[PDB]
RNA sequence: CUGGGGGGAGUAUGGUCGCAAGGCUGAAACUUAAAGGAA
């Protein structure tokens, strides 16, 4: 159509460079591209054919349809962060992979879970974290791993690890490829936090010693 | 294990632990994190 | 010193902004540069030029370009004009007394729209930077700042108090809840930019980069997240360029609506929207051939509900428009174009036929402009003024009224001069042509075709005027005499290079000519003697000037510096660097060695030729200053530029510990005040309900920062630092320790901010009672005893509750890792090969040791 | 296809004959552009 051109038989038709096509299994003596403007491109191996589609404008509409989708359901997550209802906020921040908003939805849902009253979040949120697949739970535990390295943000990470452990299958969690380099990374952080909170609760009994002194006062 | 940098490019991962995404940061925090990265490069 | 100033500016009618129309056809407010001028369309005389009260060039004028006006907007009924400028400021004026009422800076870049809302007292403003600010006029305050767009606000539409909807120079349209000031619904309108927005209440219309105009249905009473504003279909226009203003009307007397899309180039596409009766009676006709395919056809609406109309064209590029209507046969549309001109068109329409093959302009205000940049300015003895243009619009303005009284048609004309008796103009054009005009009679005394082989560039009269010099880009200069009132070519000097400036001395002595070959040559007129060659400028060299004593010349160029030369020996004196773009012109005063230089970076500069200081730095233009001309006597100077402007210049501290202590005292005072209020409520609900306490009003700072007292104390306890925390807790006495215990006792009932501050509460509380243990166990009060017991129970319950899930997660995660290991670790029964395998598969880390 | 100063290894040089330094270039009669160098 003016200036880019097709060539054959690397094992494949290639256009001018960009867009290595599917090709074949072996060699090739074939190009017929000569319908209307530049329509159906027949490209043939020894036996197998391909009838390559059309002017390549189909992909751009598909390419321009995702960005519109992502900017649409980015302005649903902000509305959910505004008005609460943290479950679709959770799964949609998992879909967008927005990490500090994920920390915010888990932290404020955890704070209101501490507020009101087996279940550690609201039950619709922990079934929503129960029904998520391997890629989502492995990235969720990637960032539970890196949240667990603090002494401040560790509790949200520990309770997300807890609900994953009690809402998924343990053999499945082991067989997911990648989740043995994560749990090795954040077992010893849980160990030092356990020693620190155990030391804190053992030095918590000066209140009890002060009570028994205050009772021996009279 | 220690929190390095992000394995993506639309993400910013501080050594604190707080991973931020560039699509979710506002422009104020984008300028602020860029200046803070300039300080940590300059030292 | 007797400094300069600006007397008056003119030459502009319509500049780089919009226009608002006022009813009596009617009048029109539009923009000149940095001041607004009102015009009556009927006659066209300048009835008002509302300007700033300070002359640009005075003592307190600040050292930058003045703020160019960029958006006019008018409140009709209460008679206000909200105008907005290039730096971001917004001046609101009363049009009766023409003073400034309101200054509303606010923004950071240029502003792009204004709108009055709820007709008075509220003004919304959108700017180049992506903010959009609401202002009240009874409070002089920016109320709200809607801040989520990304590039530049191209339009919006608001209704009062609840919904705004903006669209910006990214691809995005946004709908704003003005109660919460959070963006509610965001779409991608067009894939590039989004330049248009208009809406008649049901349908919304937007346009983007190229001809794709999108119809939207906004349903304001919707409840779904995506779906307050849906998209209903696209259509096409005839212009492939940026449609950048859309606007609607409802003509009365039946009820009908019309909208226009103005374009980048030259063209406004007008449209009639039809009515629901022809929607209903046109649906079946495209629903013919009788339904999945018919439903797809009915879904694929724009050409259905919208009807194109008379596509109004213009001569020039279109900048802004607005209309009025009666009868649906008087769509009367005013239009300001880029080359400064307003035009009042009006299309008729007999409600079925638009009754014309092409619409008709009923008025045109174009007399006080040029349509191009003035490439040459000139002056009389003192009375008249000469402006030379590219279309042909030579114009003879006058100084004492600023009105063009005489105008002709020449061509691409770049230099001109008067003739020494007055009332006579010589001029040279871009092509090989020269022309002569006068003041009393008509245009052409005579033209000389083939005055030069190529582009003329500069001419100069002699001081008696009988003999003039023309230098042109055909590498020649020529001399002409005036024979009796006609031109006599007699001699011609061909050079090796394209001569582009000439000048003679003011006493018939020298002929200095500036070549393209980086030099000038000074000749004797009486011999063509080649006196001097001044060299070393290092780019091609523009305007020369010879002083009144014929001793000192100036030399301007595109090297951003002017050189002073002494003409007796051709020796340089200064090489002073001005003007960071290009000095287009440089001119002496009449009697002094002071001079002026106007340049290609929108500035003229006043210098002296003795100390070579800069006397003054005059800053009134907006763009490239193409020419300037000084009076022959007296010395007032005019300057004329690329922004179509012509302007005259004449002569004249606690710390941690005590912060925590005062926070503790006000917090616990509020806390036990509310607890006494609650005890009063229980006693007056459990006894004879005849009395109770009146009201404890909450604390000023607590309702000012919007915090419960536990949160207030909790964040100041957070905001002290860990290095001085053991000192902050040691400073405070035991009464503050007791009320700190009351604070902890209240805060571990709100189990939200207990669990988010557990180690801080534990650290502070345990240090406090560990330090104050001797006095605490000697206090005798069962209230504090029960307090300590309650704090102990709730605190230890929270701590064991968090270490429960810590221990759960330890055992669960090591079970997961161990069952993965016994699933597929490896197979070694021999202990030595096993330990070497584990040593090869261990985690290594390398450390820098010292020996 | 005849014509010859005086050893080898060094060292110094207020003599004679040379060659060689400066110091951002542009850039001087001009404290001057662009661009380049250096750090």
Coordinates of N, CA and C in Angstrom, one line a residue, chain C residues 660-661 663-665 668 671 713-714 717 720 725 728-729 732-747 760-769 772 784 787-788 791:
Chain C
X660 N 2.1 17.3 75.8 CA 1.3 16.2 76.3 C 0.5 16.6 77.5
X661 N 1.1 17.4 78.4 CA 0.4 17.8 79.6 C -0.8 18.6 79.3
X663 N -2.5 18.8 76.5 CA -3.4 18.0 75.8 C -4.1 17.0 76.7
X664 N -3.4 16.4 77.7 CA -4.0 15.6 78.7 C -5.0 16.3 79.5
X665 N -4.7 17.6 79.9 CA -5.7 18.3 80.8 C -6.9 18.7 80.0
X668 N -8.9 15.2 79.2 CA -9.6 14.6 80.3 C -10.7 15.5 80.9
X671 N -13.5 14.7 78.8 CA -14.0 13.4 79.0 C -14.8 13.3 80.3
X713 N -5.5 13.3 72.0 CA -4.4 12.9 72.9 C -3.5 11.8 72.2
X714 N -4.2 11.0 71.5 CA -3.4 9.9 70.8 C -2.5 10.4 69.7
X717 N 0.4 12.2 71.4 CA 1.3 11.2 72.0 C 2.1 10.5 70.9
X720 N 5.0 13.2 69.6 CA 6.3 13.2 70.3 C 7.2 12.1 69.8
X725 N 10.7 10.8 74.5 CA 9.5 10.3 75.1 C 9.7 9.9 76.5
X728 N 9.6 13.2 78.2 CA 8.2 13.7 78.2 C 7.3 13.1 79.2
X729 N 7.5 11.8 79.4 CA 6.8 11.1 80.5 C 7.4 11.3 81.9
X732 N 6.2 15.0 83.6 CA 4.8 15.3 84.1 C 4.6 14.7 85.5
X733 N 3.9 15.5 86.3 CA 3.7 15.1 87.7 C 2.7 14.0 87.8
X734 N 2.4 13.6 89.1 CA 1.6 12.5 89.3 C 0.1 12.7 89.1
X735 N -0.4 14.0 89.2 CA -1.8 14.3 88.8 C -2.0 14.1 87.3
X736 N -1.0 14.4 86.5 CA -1.1 14.2 85.1 C -0.9 12.7 84.8
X737 N -0.2 12.0 85.7 CA -0.1 10.5 85.6 C -1.4 9.9 85.8
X738 N -2.2 10.4 86.8 CA -3.5 9.8 87.1 C -4.5 10.1 86.0
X739 N -4.4 11.3 85.4 CA -5.3 11.5 84.3 C -4.8 10.9 83.0
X740 N -3.5 10.6 82.9 CA -3.1 9.7 81.8 C -3.6 8.3 82.0
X741 N -3.8 7.8 83.2 CA -4.4 6.5 83.4 C -5.9 6.5 83.1
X742 N -6.5 7.7 83.4 CA -7.9 7.8 82.9 C -8.0 7.8 81.4
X743 N -7.0 8.4 80.7 CA -7.0 8.5 79.3 C -6.9 7.1 78.7
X744 N -5.9 6.3 79.3 CA -5.7 4.9 78.8 C -7.0 4.0 79.1
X745 N -7.6 4.3 80.2 CA -8.8 3.5 80.6 C -9.9 3.8 79.7
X746 N -10.1 5.1 79.2 CA -11.1 5.3 78.2 C -10.7 4.8 76.9
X747 N -9.5 4.9 76.5 CA -9.1 4.5 75.1 C -9.2 3.0 74.9
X760 N 2.6 1.4 71.4 CA 2.7 2.7 71.9 C 2.1 2.9 73.2
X761 N 0.8 2.4 73.4 CA 0.1 2.4 74.6 C 0.8 1.6 75.7
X762 N 1.3 0.4 75.3 CA 2.1 -0.5 76.2 C 3.4 0.2 76.7
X763 N 4.1 0.8 75.7 CA 5.4 1.4 76.1 C 5.2 2.6 77.0
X764 N 4.3 3.5 76.7 CA 4.0 4.6 77.5 C 3.5 4.3 78.9
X765 N 2.5 3.4 78.9 CA 1.8 3.1 80.2 C 2.8 2.3 81.1
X766 N 3.6 1.4 80.5 CA 4.5 0.7 81.4 C 5.6 1.5 81.9
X767 N 6.1 2.4 81.1 CA 7.1 3.3 81.6 C 6.5 4.3 82.6
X768 N 5.3 4.7 82.4 CA 4.7 5.7 83.4 C 4.5 5.0 84.7
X769 N 3.9 3.8 84.8 CA 3.7 3.2 86.1 C 5.0 2.6 86.7
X772 N 6.6 5.8 88.2 CA 5.8 6.3 89.3 C 5.2 5.2 90.2
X784 N -9.3 4.2 91.3 CA -8.0 4.0 90.6 C -7.7 2.5 90.7
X787 N -9.7 1.0 88.1 CA -9.2 1.5 86.8 C -8.0 0.7 86.4
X788 N -7.0 0.4 87.3 CA -5.9 -0.4 86.9 C -6.3 -1.8 86.6
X791 N -7.8 -1.6 82.9 CA -6.8 -1.4 82.0 C -6.0 -2.7 81.8

